[PDB]
């Protein structure tokens, strides 16, 4: 069991900026955190690729 004052643990989040040269992805939410969703084709492997980061 842990008993902590609010000012004990500091947590910092940041949402990556969708780069200029990328397909316009969406932004998602996880318990109040903003998540960057990116998608990009792969013609060499003939398949889609997706990323979701923070």
């Amino acid at each position: 069991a842990y008993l902590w004052h609010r000012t004990a643990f500091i947590l910092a989040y940041r949402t990556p900026v969708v780069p200029e040269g990328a397909k316009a992805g969406a932004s998602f939410s996880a318990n109040g955190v903003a998540l960057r969703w990116l998608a990009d084709y792969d013609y060499s492997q003939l398949g889609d690729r997706t990323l979701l980061d923070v």
Binding site: S44, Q45, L46, G47
Partner: protein
């Protein structure tokens, strides 16, 4: 081109757009030439249009 579905390799075969060409040319000079000695021009020929130009 056709490839098997769900094939582990993903390479595709490109296609080149090859255009061909051929030439058209002028190569002949069709003519009809007539020489009339002055004696023939004065005496023999009596109607130039009907007797020379039309032939």
């Amino acid at each position: 081109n056709r490839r098997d579905l769900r094939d582990p390799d993903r390479t595709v075969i490109a296609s080149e757009l090859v255009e061909h060409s051929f030439g058209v040319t002028l190569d002949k000079h069709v003519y009809a030439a007539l020489k009339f000695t002055d004696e023939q021009r004065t005496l023999d020929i009596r109607d130039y249009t009907k007797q020379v130009l039309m032939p």
